[PDB]
Design a protein around this ligand. Structure first.
Ligand SMILES: O=c1[nH]cnc2c([C@@H]3N[C@H](CO)[C@@H](O)[C@H]3O)c[nH]c12
Ligand SMILES: O=c1[nH]cnc2c([C@@H]3N[C@H](CO)[C@@H](O)[C@H]3O)c[nH]c12
Ligand SMILES: O=c1[nH]cnc2c([C@@H]3N[C@H](CO)[C@@H](O)[C@H]3O)c[nH]c12
Ligand SMILES: O=c1[nH]cnc2c([C@@H]3N[C@H](CO)[C@@H](O)[C@H]3O)c[nH]c12
Ligand SMILES: O=c1[nH]cnc2c([C@@H]3N[C@H](CO)[C@@H](O)[C@H]3O)c[nH]c12
Ligand SMILES: O=c1[nH]cnc2c([C@@H]3N[C@H](CO)[C@@H](O)[C@H]3O)c[nH]c12
Lengths: 243, 243, 243, 243, 243, 243
């Protein structure tokens, strides 16, 4: 009995799961683990069992956008997942403080999607699990990797238009740290399904300055590597609790 | 230079574009053409230039979900595309009429997403271009493939919960024929960007009966084949004009 | 029995109905038909059975405003009407392309009313029927009357204030062609009551330039006549199929 | 210059105006006054200068519907009107207390329309003038005509459907006394334009019991006569004050 | 048994109740009456029975804010109160007309709170009881104390931020006269619970000019005294009837 | 000068502040500290400087309700406060797990208020600070006091009615642990003003079971005492960071 989109089975899902947007990232991550086992690759959902520091945990891609990652999260959550951490890139909403290559560990997010709203009233908060957040921060510390912490704007609109103003500036003034497209959806589904969520992101630019060239098409190896070591370090530590 | 996510160039975009959800479908579609030229494959976005009936039109996958597909559509719309037709699967909202395997050509959709709303007020209608819609029907007729016509509910939620009621039943009563996850976004973006759009779908089940086993993990072969034939034919005809 | 406001009987309703706003316009139309038969006149609703090219179809006024025209359309749709085509005036939202006298056939509208929302969720599209739209266009073609095609903004507010800004500018940018006050309501009511709908309009000005005198109290004589011909033609053709 | 819809000049507008919905009603009232002067009749808007008790004031019909009567009310408010009292019919939302033929003078109203919201935020109250309200109740008293007082639900939807529940039950529980289609609109435009407003209504049924036949196509003759005298009386008193 | 927050029994509640925000204002009021009886003091809720002009009635403080006062109004309304009149301070939204020290008797309010919305749909009006409104204006007249009349904006936000614009300017244009923090909540709860409400306020500054020093930490003494006399006077006339 | 409502000077505000609902409660708290200094008592806002474990910090009452507490929180945040911890009571939304007397430390909340929405869009999350959250949890551990952790629903409605359904059952299903009236307001204002917030609460009942007598008028003594020690110890620890 395979999951509609993940195409893996309930028994293949581990208590801890690391999710990334791009299926290509999963290939690049598994290779940095001690060992790995490919499980499946359907549509944009690539699943690979990872082995790191004596721990077992999956790495599944969820694709771009909230609606699509929700399919992934729901299938994981409703079939055994206990801890889901997202690792990806984001834009800066505090250009004078957080810049390209920087890593931010988010504890909550703005719900600028639709799926979470079709799941629960807008007043409900999109908040991650403290423990996942704390473990991600401690691993960063142990790897002597400096990081930022804050709220992420999870917006379904990457390319804004000139009719309806973007709420990015409002949220910047509101002290939101960064902007991406999945975290809020992950957090809300997680709390509704009693699954611990977290999120660590690396900055690839600032949407306020895209027209100025404030955007990297590719991340600096060293930096991306650091964020991955943190994420993997965290999953390993969190998985130990369910071994 | 390449487009951020598609990874192709402005010159590589044909005036007509056939968009699908699964990147694997693009492969299964390219082979059935006279000849093709693989262009790129980034994340869930595979771009192949198709050759059919002496015409040139691209076949691009947009992934699952509106936020992710809007990324695809915006990059196409803002870089040359004059016509975009979505071909994918959907669910039936009229079980006593539309069953598994049936094909439906839609001309309008329910905007149960968030990205379109971040673009223009919700009162704005998500409607396809008439000619595209008509062209799709004439091809279905020439090929002698009976099809339905109607409104598709484009919802960002695939797996509903037990707290906030789904609006599928209401829309069913409102006479909406089908339910999927991207059309409404395509139409709205098309209208704003002045790009003609249309959509044709093949039913894979009925969400009101998933619990009773009404769902196909695999689309009906001959029906899928006919739909793709209709789509390719329609794309070929429309492409002709622009050439 | 008689319908509450139209004061006509169910048996007096023809499958095809032509609806106008001003009841004084229903008299001007009946006189250009081969023959007619006055049915009733209550409040702002004047009903007449028109005879044209061997076909019989009613011509009913619906008054200004969505709420009032809804009362008229509900009684028509719930008592026999199968097709309803609205013919009236509108303002241009594209002053550089669409000017006074011009005629526009719309296939969708912006739901800036309240009745449609009291009837169905705001995400539902206000879209007219394909055949009706096609018919109107072909009839315009045969008469060699050049017409525009696009979305209409149906707003309950004719006279804007200075507190809450008008959304017309946004819709103009979103590529909506014109603006009037009843099309969206007709469309939604029809989709709900399985009644084919459509609309054709003649421009009497541009709300963006009213203060500059850009507005006609009287419609362009010949242009109005052409629209009426197109309308009567489409009714005749549609009434034939139903008979 | 004539108003766009009313087709009367600015100098033809008296400080006090009595508005009814049916243009036929304006004729049946003018004859009950000492004398009168027919001013104009365009669309559903018929205007007549009434002479009663040595005082002068217009009687203009507004048609069925919030959007329609708004065009009327705006043209009057922006051109002289200081006081506008609406007298029409309504349904009871309190079947055990308010019944057919009963008269209700309303001080406030539920804004279930769209134009008011396009004018100011929904939080703003639809409330009439205390003095107008007061003069109406006193004219009723001097005529020994018992009347009810309360809130009117002004809803753009006359014929409800079975998808989106009607809020009428809710408002009945909230103690709204009556239901009609124009009062809230008049009150909001009025406070915004600094025009005093009020309304008197006669009950023709109870929408909760329409299916049982709790409705009258024709109002109780004498009861209708009383309400109109109260209205004409109130109008005369206020007009005097404005003399 | 004692009400949860007021800590008084149902038998200690009189048909007429005068509410104020500051519990300190209660002590300053009782000594201006012929006599009094301290009832209770819990949290910000101070109740005292007042004896004025041979009539009995309570004076209860409700604290700052719509949610806190709703708790107060509900315990009073669900346990006997028939009339509740609020007497407090407010800011001016019409600095060209209403100044510090001026008194305003309000008949309706803008519902910029949340409690009233969790009680009834937003379209419902926040309107006071006419008799109460009239009784206050007449007492004012008998005391030769000029007063203003108008709509009050009851907003939950006292200190605006720079991200989301304040709606006060919009409401000033809409002609709202004054702004405070509990009137609309009292009115709505009142209408729902069949309790008659009213409100008399004294201006302590204008929020549009706080940055220019337009604010009084202490209200104009003589003026505050006049308003308190108008209130006690009104409470006496109203309590008289019930007795 | 003094803060408008709290009546204390900017210089009298310490970096860490302990806020509570009942002013009567701050007097009961200062007495358990080493020493204290009364600062002011205006309306429901009582301010006292507390000296505890070699540290200093204020304890201020904010009264019942979000609009009321916001006044308190704004005056504190805009004048030097760096950390604000709310210690209050709450109702349980999980009667089978969390019971009366139990203590719950919250890190996020549902924004069922108006003020926070008047400061920023609803999608913004109401989340507390991690350090504060962890500090409170660590202090609980050291004192060997078991506590629950979870989301609190902050709702402006204490007494619901029968027209509009309460959302409490929904949030119970969405896994929110408890319900109170001011935490979401504090969190939002904190994030906007760059002030670290937190919240610890003691259960006094279950709103789902009030009708069955599931409510304590008096908080469980030893449990209340335990919670206060946790709050005082947390404030002391956090204040150390600013010494
Ligand atoms: O500046 C940005 N805005 C919005 N999303 C992203 C992302 C993340 N990368 C993906 C889009 O490239 C998507 O998954 C999003 O979550 C990186 N930078 C940005
Ligand atoms: O019953 C259905 N509900 C929602 N989406 C789909 C789909 C389409 N397939 C994809 C999800 O498998 C997604 O792209 C969606 O548009 C098929 N059947 C259904
Ligand atoms: O510029 C315009 N704005 C809004 N409505 C109209 C109309 C149509 N005419 C009527 C109002 O005169 C109304 O029925 C509306 O649909 C013409 N021009 C305009
Ligand atoms: O039961 C009712 N519901 C809604 N409107 C009305 C009316 C009034 N009469 C008109 C519709 O016949 C319309 O102007 C409306 O305001 C009478 N009875 C009812
Ligand atoms: O300018 C103002 N804005 C908002 N509220 C008030 C008030 C009233 N005083 C209290 C706040 O100080 C609160 O009860 C409010 O209703 C006085 N002046 C103003
Ligand atoms: O069951 C409950 N619902 C809502 N608030 C509270 C409270 C807290 N107590 C106060 C209301 O009594 C208010 O400050 C609120 O935050 C205790 N129990 C409940």
């Amino acid at each position: 009995n395979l999951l509609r989109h993940l195409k893996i089975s309930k028994e293949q899902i581990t208590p801890v799961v690391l999710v990334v947007g791009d299926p290509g990232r999963v290939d690049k991550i598994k290779v940095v683990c001690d060992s790995y086992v490919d499980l499946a690759y359907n549509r944009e959902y690539k699943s690979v069992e990872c082995h790191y520091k004596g721990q077992k945990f999956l790495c599944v891609s969820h694709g771009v956008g909230s609606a699509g990652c929700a399919v992934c999260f729901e299938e994981l959550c409703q079939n055994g997942a206990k801890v889901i951490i997202r690792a990806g890139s984001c834009g800066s909403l505090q250009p004078d403080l957080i810049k390209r290559g920087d890593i931010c560990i988010c504890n909550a997010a703005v719900r600028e999607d639709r799926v979470s709203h079709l799941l629960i009233h807008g007043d409900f908060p999109a908040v991650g699990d403290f423990d996942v957040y704390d473990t991600l921060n401690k691993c960063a510390q142990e790897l002597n990797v400096p990081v930022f912490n804050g709220i992420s704007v999870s917006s379904d609109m990457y390319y804004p238009n000139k009719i309806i103003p973007s709420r990015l500036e409002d949220y910047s003034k509101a002290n939101a740290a960064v902007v991406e497209m999945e975290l809020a959806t992950l957090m809300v589904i997680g709390t509704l399904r009693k699954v611990k969520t977290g999120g660590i992101l690396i900055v690839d630019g600032c949407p306020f300055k895209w027209d100025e060239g404030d955007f990297d098409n590719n991340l600096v190896p060293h930096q991306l590597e650091n964020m991955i070591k943190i994420a993997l370090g965290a999953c390993a530590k969190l998985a130990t609790k369910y071994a």
